[PDB]
Ligand binder design. Structure first.
Ligand code: BVL
Length: 121
């Protein structure tokens, strides 16, 4: 659910999901269309794509459990939706950590209309 995810992002990057990753580039946040603007935006696009192949799950509200095995995010057993949602989020937290260096504030609050071009999952 968005609660586990927001916590995950914070633990990883140190930043708060909102407003850092709630309105970034073209895919972080509310939907997306166009070309991801940078690496951090590519993480969002892939995450969206991840949620994308779980049609009958509900990522934003289904809660799941995860532990930390000396740094490592470890998704605990749940329903098949919860396990797979966890894995989606997990990779985004990491993808974020892994591209902090290029996180650019120029892309926070990016306007819709500049999200031009096309891109498939
Ligand atoms: C503790 O967390 C919350 C977290 C949230 O993210 C929201 C919220 O209402 C909408 C969030 C948002 C929506 C789309 C998106 O792509 C990124 C962030 C609302 C609440 C909690 C609200 C209370 C009023 C107890």
């Amino acid at each position: 659910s968005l609660l586990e995810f927001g916590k995950m992002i914070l633990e990883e990057t140190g930043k708060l999901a909102i407003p850092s990753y709630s309105s970034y580039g073209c895919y972080c946040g509310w939907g997306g269309k166009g070309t991801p603007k940078d690496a951090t935006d590519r993480c969002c696009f892939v995450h969206d794509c991840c949620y994308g192949n779980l049609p009958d799950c509900n990522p934003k509200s289904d809660r799941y459990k995860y532990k930390r095995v000396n740094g490592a995010i470890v998704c605990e057993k749940g329903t098949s939706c919860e396990n797979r949602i966890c894995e989606c989020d997990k990779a985004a937290a990491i993808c974020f950590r892994q591209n902090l260096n290029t996180y650019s504030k120029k892309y926070m609050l990016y306007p819709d209309f500049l999200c031009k071009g096309e891109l498939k999952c």
